[PDB]
Design a binder for this molecule. Structure first.
Ligand SMILES: Cc1nc2ccc(Cl)cc2c(Cc2ccccc2Cl)c1C(=O)O
Length: 134
């Protein structure tokens, strides 16, 4: 479909702002925040037909999700939440909403110049994480 072509590839985390505070707001505990916050994950995005796969590999945890846009799925997050997720494309932005225990967080992924920018929002707290091609 050429849906998501500009996201496909292997990406490495190069900068982060406010991520500890985002994780606090989400409810992540101290030790997980410390170790997860040190990580420099490799995110690998691929598409096969209508199925998008996002893998993250790091010293902390490796995660993998596969999904169809607009179609809710189960995800266990790197901090071990069991959430129900829905990912859509809105105006060229991948919008990932996670629901658990009456709570919600949204992660937006966008191409900007040669970067892939990840914005994580929990209530009034936003974190911005920048990935570059690996
Ligand atoms: C959006 C996002 N949300 C996260 C939420 C919780 C945790 Cl512990 C790590 C997260 C990470 C980092 C991460 C993701 C997967 C595996 C290891 C790590 Cl440290 C990211 C991210 O930068 O993709």
């Amino acid at each position: 479909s050429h849906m998501c072509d500009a996201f496909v590839g292997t990406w490495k985390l190069v900068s982060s702002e406010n991520f500890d505070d985002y994780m606090k707001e989400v409810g992540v505990g101290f030790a997980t925040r410390k170790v997860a916050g040190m990580a420099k994950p490799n995110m690998i995005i691929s598409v096969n037909g209508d199925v998008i796969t996002i893998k993250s590999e790091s010293t902390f945890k490796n995660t993998e999700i596969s999904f169809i846009l607009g179609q809710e799925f189960d995800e266990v997050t790197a901090d071990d939440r069991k959430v129900k997720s829905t990912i859509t494309l809105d105006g060229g932005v991948l919008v990932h909403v996670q629901k658990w225990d009456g709570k919600s967080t949204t992660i937006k992924r966008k191409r900007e110049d040669d970067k892939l920018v990840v914005e994580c929002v929990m209530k009034g707290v936003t974190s911005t994480r920048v990935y570059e091609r690996a």
